Amino acid sequence: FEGGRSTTLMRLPKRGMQGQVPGEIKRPRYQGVNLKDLARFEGEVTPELLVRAGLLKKGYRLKILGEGEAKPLKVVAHAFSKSALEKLKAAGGEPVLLEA
Amino acid sequence: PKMKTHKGAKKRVKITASGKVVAMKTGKRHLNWQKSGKEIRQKGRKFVLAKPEAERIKLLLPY
Amino acid sequence: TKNGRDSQAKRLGVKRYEGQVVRAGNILVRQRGTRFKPGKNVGMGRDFTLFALVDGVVEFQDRGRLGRYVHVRPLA
Amino acid sequence: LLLECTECKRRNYATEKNKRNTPNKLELRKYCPWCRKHTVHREV
RNA sequence: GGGCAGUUUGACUGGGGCGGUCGCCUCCUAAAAGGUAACGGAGGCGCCCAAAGGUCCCCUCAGGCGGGACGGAAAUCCGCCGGAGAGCGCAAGGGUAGAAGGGGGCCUGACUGCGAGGCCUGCAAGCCGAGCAGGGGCGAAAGCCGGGCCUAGUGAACCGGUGGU
RNA sequence: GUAAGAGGAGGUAUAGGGAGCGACGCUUGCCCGGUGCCGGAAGGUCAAGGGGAGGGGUGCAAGCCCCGAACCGAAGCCCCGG
RNA sequence: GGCGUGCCUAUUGAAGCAUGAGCCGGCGACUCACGGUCGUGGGCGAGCUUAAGCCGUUGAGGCGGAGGCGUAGGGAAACCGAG
RNA sequence: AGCCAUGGGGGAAUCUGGGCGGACCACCGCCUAAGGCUAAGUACUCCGGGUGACCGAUAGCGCACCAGUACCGUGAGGGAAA
RNA sequence: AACCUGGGGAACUGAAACAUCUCAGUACCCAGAGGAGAGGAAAGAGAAAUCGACUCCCUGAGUAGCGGCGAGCGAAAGGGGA
Numbered sequence: 001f002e003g004g005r006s007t008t009l010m011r012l013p014k015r016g017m018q019g020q021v022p023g024e025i026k027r028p029r030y031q032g033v034n035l036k037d038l039a040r041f042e043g044e045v046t047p048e049l050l051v052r053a054g055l056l057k058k059g060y061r062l063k064i065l066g067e068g069e070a071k072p073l074k075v076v077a078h079a080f081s082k083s084a085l086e087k088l089k090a091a092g093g094e095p096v097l098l099e100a
Numbered sequence: 101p102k103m104k105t106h107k108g109a110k111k112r113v114k115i116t117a118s119g120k121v122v123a124m125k126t127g128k129r130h131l132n133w134q135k136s137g138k139e140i141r142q143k144g145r146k147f148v149l150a151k152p153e154a155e156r157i158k159l160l161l162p163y
Numbered sequence: 164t165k166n167g168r169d170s171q172a173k174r175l176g177v178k179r180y181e182g183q184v185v186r187a188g189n190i191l192v193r194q195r196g197t198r199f200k201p202g203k204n205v206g207m208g209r210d211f212t213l214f215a216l217v218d219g220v221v222e223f224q225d226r227g228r229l230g231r232y233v234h235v236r237p238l239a
Numbered sequence: 240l241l242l243e244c245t246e247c248k249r250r251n252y253a254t255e256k257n258k259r260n261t262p263n264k265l266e267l268r269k270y271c272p273w274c275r276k277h278t279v280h281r282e283v
Numbered sequence: 284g285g286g287c288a289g290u291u292u293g294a295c296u297g298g299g300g301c302g303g304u305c306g307c308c309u310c311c312u313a314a315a316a317g318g319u320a321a322c323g324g325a326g327g328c329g330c331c332c333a334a335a336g337g338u339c340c341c342c343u344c345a346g347g348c349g350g351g352a353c354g355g356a357a358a359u360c361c362g363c364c365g366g367a368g369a370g371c372g373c374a375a376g377g378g379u380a381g382a383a384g385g386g387g388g389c390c391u392g393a394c395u396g397c398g399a400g401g402c403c404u405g406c407a408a409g410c411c412g413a414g415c416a417g418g419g420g421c422g423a424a425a426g427c428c429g430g431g432c433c434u435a436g437u438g439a440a441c442c443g444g445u446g447g448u
Numbered sequence: 449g450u451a452a453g454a455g456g457a458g459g460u461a462u463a464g465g466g467a468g469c470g471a472c473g474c475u476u477g478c479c480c481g482g483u484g485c486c487g488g489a490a491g492g493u494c495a496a497g498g499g500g501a502g503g504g505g506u507g508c509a510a511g512c513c514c515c516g517a518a519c520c521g522a523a524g525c526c527c528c529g530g
Numbered sequence: 531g532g533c534g535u536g537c538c539u540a541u542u543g544a545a546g547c548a549u550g551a552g553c554c555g556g557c558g559a560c561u562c563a564c565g566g567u568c569g570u571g572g573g574c575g576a577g578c579u580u581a582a583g584c585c586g587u588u589g590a591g592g593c594g595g596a597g598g599c600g601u602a603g604g605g606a607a608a609c610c611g612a613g
Numbered sequence: 614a615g616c617c618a619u620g621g622g623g624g625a626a627u628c629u630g631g632g633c634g635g636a637c638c639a640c641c642g643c644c645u646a647a648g649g650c651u652a653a654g655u656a657c658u659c660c661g662g663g664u665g666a667c668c669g670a671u672a673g674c675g676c677a678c679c680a681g682u683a684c685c686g687u688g689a690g691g692g693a694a695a
Numbered sequence: 696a697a698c699c700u701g702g703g704g705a706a707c708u709g710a711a712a713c714a715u716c717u718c719a720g721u722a723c724c725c726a727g728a729g730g731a732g733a734g735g736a737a738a739g740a741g742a743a744a745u746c747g748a749c750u751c752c753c754u755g756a757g758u759a760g761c762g763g764c765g766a767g768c769g770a771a772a773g774g775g776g777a
């Protein structure tokens with residue numbers, strides 16, 4: 001704060017959507033999970049297992065991707081990176097999310 | 101109790117993943133009238149700061 | 164009275180000196196007009212700013228009638 | 240006088256400065272929009 | 284609508300007040316880099332220009348002496364002398380005819396998307412800029428053009444207006 | 449005093465409120481432009497509201513919702529005068 | 531006989547003819563809560579940790595993963611993602 | 614700028630009814646206003662009890678002692694020492 | 696004594712001035728209630744073709760938002776408990 005002068009608050013807000021009366025809109029929340037940790041344990045990975053112990057934390061959605069060597073197994077996920085779908089396609093199935 | 105995030109600062113400044121603070125270039129909304137294409141472009145990109153970076157950190161802390 | 168006035172210092176003159184290594188683009192010397200001319204691998208801007216175009220060392224070359232030139236001898 | 244040039248058959252502006260009484264009523268100078276490249280720009 | 288209420292009524296300042304000033308540019312002070320105060324000396328700006336701009340080619344001043352119909356100290360034409368003492372829109376300085384100065388032709392780079400690396404700097408801000416891409420002007424071309432020889436001609440943020448995405 | 453009510457006054461313009469001069473003697477000049485106040489059914493300006501030309505949103509449409517010109521609109525101010 | 535300008539505060543400067551104290555004795559002033567930031571000792575480690583609360587105790591501990599920090603960033607956002 | 618409440622004006626309908634889901638429309642969906650009652654979980658501590666890395670007569674309640682007393686104020690009120 | 700609901704309701708102070716804001720619906724005044732009070736069986740919440748009165752504790756969260764977008768102010772749904 002203080003100085004007596006116009007504080008360094010001279011900067012400005014480009015951030016749009018900074019606010020709205022009714023508040024927040026209810027939209028999905030995709031969790032970025034790297035397949036490197038996904039490769040750690042092996043069996044049949046699903047949102048159930050990740051939230052049960054991993055890096056999901058009750059997040060609304062799941063989405064594997066990133067660096068790492070994809071182990072062989074079915075990977076049920078809400079979304080896939082174009083590069084992510086490659087590693088698993090090299091040795092595994094591609095179980096998409098729900099729909100209803 | 102419980103530091104209150106300075107909303108006036110958050111709405112205008114985002115912190116980098118590392119530890120740096122970034123904000124838009126100043127002077128680009130009003131003074132304008134017919135400045136060199138360089139200026140208006142130079143003002144388009146955001147930037148890093150120096151000491152007061154630490155200052156503005158001590159606000160969006162809970163954030 | 165009515166006199167206390169003066170535009171702040173522009174801090175011009177010779178910035179870079181001979182025998183100095185330099186990157187590419189370094190404003191070698193700022194000037195008021197043409198107190199110094201460009202030269203080998205040395206460009207200038209509107210305000211008559213002298214700046215390197217290459218990487219090397221600064222060098223000065225007086226030539227009386229022509230004037231005082233400044234250039235950077237490339238090397239690596 | 241503050242001037243602003245528009246684009247033909249499109250919707251784009253540009254910084255300018257015309258003259259009031261001084262010999263200068265219209266502005267038919269060419270310019271470069273974002274869509275495609277180079278098209279005449281009127282005052283308007 | 285002072286009947287009543289709540290408040291504001293600046294700073295510098297050889298004590299206050301009165302007076303003057305408050306931002307930006309030029310020079311001096313400033314002690315041969317930079318910078319450097321004083322109610323220290325001395326002046327300007329809050330603009331202007333589609334041509335007073337980009338480019339290609341052409342062209343060279345002021346003043347002095349002599350000659351010349353009106354003019355005549357000085358309009359215009361001729362000759363010789365004449366390195367910058369002119370001009371460079373407007374203050375001053377540095378610069379400049381080996382052009383940045385005067386003229387004609389074509390013409391709109393008074394572009395969008397960027398920006399290596401720097402000067403200056405507490406912050407913010409200011410200032411320079413090669414080279415790259417798209418595309419376009421002048422030129423045979425090498426090449427120049429990201430506004431005026433240059434350093435003043437300006438205002439963070441907020442709040443709102445108009446057109447699009 | 450929020451009100452009820454009270455004073456004024458159980459008075460009635462030879463009375464009561466406000467203001468300025470301050471026994472009484474001789475007097476109290478000129479100036480309405482500015483200010484206040486008093487008079488002024490025209491005109492100008494004006495709010496809510498009325499009015500709805502015309503325009504928008506959405507829906508299959510019937511409709512629902514919204515924006516909105518001319519024009520009728522008071523005191524006040526302007527204007528005229530004392 | 532030699533040498534020698536009280537204490538405190540405030541100051542560019544005090545023995546000061548600047549402030550405070552008559553003398554003694556006692557009360558008298560950087561704390562806590564929560565949140566944050568750096569350091570530090572220690573446990574565990576892509577994991578770490580629980581809050582109300584329930585059980586027990588009568589100066590005992592235990593259970594309780596709701597939740598929070600971390601493992602991915604970037605953009606105003608749609609979105610995309612080692613970019 | 615919806616929703617809950619409502620001072621002013623206008624002012625319906627009874628399940629083909631009516632509100633709401635953040636101005637409005639449409640679709641999809643939640644709910645039944647304009648009558649009242651309802652324990653427990655919760656707050657507090659004049660009063661009693663238990664306990665304390667709480668005090669130990671300038672501390673601790675103002676008051677360990679016949680203290681809201683003496684004494685001071687017109688009065689609210691102030692308020693010891695021991 | 697304090698706690699509780701309803702009807703009224705400040706200013707200092709903060710914003711390094713101040714007037715919107717803040718202090719705060721706090722202090723105080725008033726009426727009422729009882730060991731409690733209040734609230735309470737949806738014309739609810741809000742996006743799950745989900746939950747299912749009310750009250751209180753965690754959490755949600757310093758999030759959503761509010762704001763001379765200043766100082767500052769500050770929910771709800773949902774999940775876990777009584």
Ligand SMILES: [Mg+2]
Pocket residue numbers: 141144
């Ligand atoms: Mg841009």
Ligand SMILES: [Mg+2]
Pocket residue numbers: 162163
């Ligand atoms: Mg958080």
Ligand SMILES: [Mg+2]
Pocket residue numbers: none
């Ligand atoms: Mg100088």
Ligand SMILES: [Mg+2]
Pocket residue numbers: 313
């Ligand atoms: Mg100097």
Ligand SMILES: [Mg+2]
Pocket residue numbers: none
């Ligand atoms: Mg010097």
Ligand SMILES: [Mg+2]
Pocket residue numbers: 335431
């Ligand atoms: Mg020019």
Ligand SMILES: [Mg+2]
Pocket residue numbers: none
């Ligand atoms: Mg000259």
Ligand SMILES: [Mg+2]
Pocket residue numbers: none
């Ligand atoms: Mg030329």
Ligand SMILES: [Mg+2]
Pocket residue numbers: none
């Ligand atoms: Mg020129």
Ligand SMILES: [Mg+2]
Pocket residue numbers: 404
């Ligand atoms: Mg800087």
Ligand SMILES: [Mg+2]
Pocket residue numbers: none
């Ligand atoms: Mg400047």
Ligand SMILES: [Mg+2]
Pocket residue numbers: none
């Ligand atoms: Mg190219």
Ligand SMILES: [Mg+2]
Pocket residue numbers: 441765
């Ligand atoms: Mg503001």
Ligand SMILES: [Mg+2]
Pocket residue numbers: none
């Ligand atoms: Mg009255």
Ligand SMILES: [Mg+2]
Pocket residue numbers: none
């Ligand atoms: Mg009467």
Ligand SMILES: [Mg+2]
Pocket residue numbers: 457458
């Ligand atoms: Mg009577």
